[model samples]
Target: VTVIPREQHAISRKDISENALKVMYRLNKAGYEAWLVGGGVRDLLLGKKPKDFDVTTNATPEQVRKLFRNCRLVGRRFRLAHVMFGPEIIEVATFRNIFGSIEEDAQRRDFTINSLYYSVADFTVRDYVGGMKDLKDGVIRLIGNPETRYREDPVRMLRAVRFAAKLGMRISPETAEPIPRLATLLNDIPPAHLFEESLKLLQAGYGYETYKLLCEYHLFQPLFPTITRYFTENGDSPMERIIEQVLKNTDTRIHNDMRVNPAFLFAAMFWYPLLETAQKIAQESGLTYHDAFALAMNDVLDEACRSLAIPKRLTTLTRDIWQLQLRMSRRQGKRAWKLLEHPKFRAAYDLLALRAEVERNAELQRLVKWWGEFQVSAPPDQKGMLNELD
Candidate 1:
C-alpha cells in the first residue's frame, strides 16, 4: 500500500460534495476512519468534476444512520448508507475488513482505477492497487484474475467497457483478453439490472463510444440480440443507420443537457423489429397494413421484454411514438392539426423528421417543413395550411 501525504495528491474538500464532506468529517470526528472512495475519488484525482460523491468509513450502516437524520440504509448485495440532501445523495460504505486486507479490498473491486481512497482527516491519498499510477498512464485495468473477476459479476465487463470509453483509455491486455470468451455470462444477469446498466452505458454522455465498444467486444448480442441480429444479417439496412442515428442523437442530447427518454431509445431499438414482424403478420393473416402493425408491436415488445425488462409504462409511451409515425405521415385536412395537438406530437414529429432525413424523401421533407411552420403559425393560418394538405 502506498500512502501519499496531502502534498502529493490534488484532492481538496472543495472538489467534493458538501454533504459527502460532512459525512466524512462527522465519521472522523467520532473516531472512525473516513475516506472518499470509488469513481468520485478517481475522477477528482484526475482533475475532473464528478457528478456524485461517495464516502467510505469504518462506521457501520447502523452507526452512520445514528449520526445523520437524513441517512437511510439500503442495498441488497451489501448494506450502504445514503445521506440525503434534497435531490443529491451521498453514498457511504463501511470499510470492508472481510476481504482480509486493503490490497484484497482493492483486488475485489472491478477495476484498478476505482480502488483508490482519499482520507478526509489528513488529506492523505491511499493506493492499495496502483490505481493512481494507472490513472496517470491512461489505462483501464481490472484488479485481479480476469476470468475469476468476471465470474464474480458479469456486469463488471460492461463497467470496464464503460470506464474505458468514458476515459478514452485503452483496456489492458489482461483485462480485455477474457471479455470475448466470457461475453455470454451476461445472460445470467437479471433483466432489470441489465436494463439499468445499459442506461449508464448509453446515457452517460458517451452513447456512441459505448455502443462501439460493446460491438467490438462481442458483448452487444447477449444484451440486445434483436438489434444485433438485424445488424449482422442485413449489414447495410436502414435499421442499422437508425440505431447509429439514435445513439448519436442521444449523445448530443446529453451533451446539451436536454431531456432524453429511455422510452424513445427503446422505441428506436425495436423499430425495425416491429416493422419486420408487422410485414410477416400482414402476409400471413391478410390483415390491413395498419392492423398488422398494431398487433406486431404487442408481439415484438412482449418477446423483447424477456431480455430487456422494459417497464409497461414506458412501453406504452414507446407505442405512442411508434403509432404516431403513421399519423405523422398521413395528412388529411383538420386531422393534421389534431395530430399536432397529440400529447406526443413533438416526439413523433422529431422521429418523422429523422426518418425523412435518412430516406431523403422530398415529399416527407415538404410535409415536415409545413408542420414546422404550422406549429408557430396563427390559429387561422394554421387552419388554412391544414386544409391545404388535403
Candidate 2:
C-alpha cells in the first residue's frame, strides 16, 4: 500500500466512533501504514458519519492477520484483510498498482466517489482519479475507458446506475453514455453474482429506480433471459402490475431500513412473470393453473439460476412466497389467520397492496389494507379480520 503522509491533518482514531478507532489504532500499532480510506472518508468529507471505515495499508493480508486476532485474510482479485469488531467489519486493502490486461480495474470501479483514498500518515486524500471532483459535482465517472470497463466486468455498469440512484447523483455523460449499449453484457457474468449484486441494490431500497434503469437497458433479460419475453404475451396485465407494485414497495422499504425479506421480494418480483408463463401453458395450451404455476415457477427460477444463481435458501423461500400469493387470492378465514404467522407475511401483504393499488383488484387491495391496519393493531382486532375480506 502506498503510504501518503498527511502533513497537518490531526484527525486520528480518536476523532471517529469507538469501533472505527479501534481498527485504526490496531493497524497503527502493528507498525504498518494504515488509515481509513474509501467511503468512510468520503462520508466524513460530506459531514455524514460513515457506515463503516475501510483502510488502506502497507500490511499484507497475512501480516494483517498476524497482527489482529479479529482479522481474516480474504478474496482473490483485490484481496482484503477484514478486521471484525463483533457487529462492524473494518475493510483493509493494500494500495493497488493499476493492473495490466484489466485496464478497467481502475476504470470499472462502481463510481469515482468510491475510489477516494485517505492516508493516516499524511492525512491527505490522494485524488489521483479525480474522485473528489466527482463527489462535489454529484457525478458518477468511469475510471478508465468506459467500454473496456464494461467488457471487463459488466456488474460495475449496473453499479453506476445504483450509485446514481442511491446518492441522487447524476451520472457523468462519459460514464452514462455507455450503459445503454453495454448493460446487456451482464449476460456474460454468472447469474449468482448478478443476483447478489442486484439484491444489494434492491436491499438498498433503491430497487424501484435501479430496476427501471436495469430494465430500460434490457439488462434484466440477459440476467433472467425469460423475463424479457414477459411483456410480449402478458402486455402489462396482472403480472406487470405486480412487478411495478412490488418493486415500488421494495424501494420504499430498502430506503427506510425497514424490515424486508429478500426471499419474499424475489418471489414477488418474479411471481407475475412466472404466473404469465404458467397461464400460457395452462390457458393457452390447457393445463391447470396450479400445475402450471408449479411448472412455470420452476422454469423461471431454473432459468434465473443459470444467470443469477439465486441461493438455495432464498430460492426455497421465494418459491414458498409465490405459493402464498395463491393463498392470498383465496381469502379463507382460518387460512388468513395462519398466513399471519408465515415467514414472509409482511412482504406478502405489501405485495398484495401493490397489486391492489395498481391493478385495481379491490379484493386483494382490501386484504392488503386490512392487514396493513392489523399490522399496527392489537391481537383482539387482528383475529376475524380475515372475515372482513370474506
Candidate 3:
C-alpha cells in the first residue's frame, strides 16, 4: 500500500516538532539516518498533526548517545535513545521489529497504521505490512496473528481499540474478534500504565468513542476492578451521557490542540466504578454512602491499582476528588465554604457534572451549576448566588 506524494499531502518541516528536528539534524550531521517513525508517519498520511514524533534511526542507543550530550538511554525492557531537546525529547529507536522478527514486529505493533516505516533516507513511507492500505481504509488491523500478538503483550490489544477509538474508526474484524477474550489480558498490565493508556483513549479528543469500545470489550472491571457490571446497571442514564459527553469534549479538545489532563481524565474514568461500588456497599454492606464510598474507594482503587497502578500522588488526588464530589453534592451550611477550599474541587465538580448528565441527579446538578457560576463570580455575587439557590 502506498500514499502518493501530492502537493495537498504535505506538512511543512516547520510544523515538525522541534525535538524531532533536532534529532534529525543532529543525526544527519553525524551521518546516521533518522526519520520520524511509527504514528508520526501514519498520522501524516491521514493528514493529522501528530502529538509526538518518534524517530527511527540506524544509530544504536549508544551510537545515538555519542552524538547528543543531552540524550539519555532508557527502556531497560528494550533499550532506546531519548534525545532531550528542551521540553520535548525525541524518542529514537533502531529500525528493528518491536520484538526482533520483522514478522513479529508486524504482530507486535499496536496497530497496522503504527507499523509503518518512514524512510530516513528518502522520506517515503515503507509499509512492511499492509499498514498504509489499512490506514487509508480507516481500518485498525493488527500486524501478524492477532491472538498470538495479543498474548505476546496484551497491552497492544487495548492499544488497538484505543487507536480505533482515538481515530474515530471501527475496530476492524481482524482486530475486534479477539478483544472480548483478551479483556482479561489487561490484568497483565500495571494499573498506572493501563490507566495512562485508558486516559489517552478517554481524554484524548476521541475519548467518547473509546469509552464505548471499553464497555464493548468489558475492560472496565479488569482495568478498574470496581463494580464489574456498571454498563448493565447504569444503563442509559444521565450519568452515562455525562461520561460520553466528557469524552466528546475531550475528543474535540485534542482535535483542536487544546490542553488536557491525563490525571483528571483517569479520575473521571474511575468515577462511576467508584460510585457503583459505593452504592452497592451502601445497600448490601449496610454502610452510609460516605463510609461505603470510602470503603469502596479503597477496595476499588486497590483492584485498579493491581492493574493500572495509579501513582501514589495521583491516586491520592483521585480519591480526594472522588470523595469531594459526594460532599459537594450536599451543599448546605458551611459545606459550601469548605468545599471551595479543596484543591481537588474543580476536578470533583467536573465529575459531578458528568454524573448529573447520566444520573440526572437534580440536586447534584444544582450543586454543579452553583459552583459553575460561583467560580467566576465575586464575593458579593457569590452571596446573591447562594440566595438564589435558596
**Which candidate gets the maximum lDDT versus the true structure?**
1
RMSD of each: 2.3, 4.5, 4.0
lDDT tens digits by residue: candidate 2, 331-354: 576666687789766666656666
Candidates ranked by lDDT: 1, 2, 3
By TM-score, rank the candidates, best first.
1, 2, 3
* TM, every model: 0.92, 0.82, 0.81
lDDT of 3 by residue, 214-287 (tens): 77787655875553445556476444555667777777868788776556766776677776667767898755
Model 3 compared with the native: what TM-score?
0.81
lDDT of 3 at 244: 67
Candidate 1, residues 278-325, lDDT tens digits: the string is 888898996788888988998787777777688888899999998988
- Poorest stretch of ten by lDDT in candidate 1: 96-105
Using alpha carbons, what is the TM-score of model 1?
0.92
Candidate 2: stretches off by over 4 Å: 1-14, 69-78, 97-110, 231-241, 284-286, 331-337, 366-390
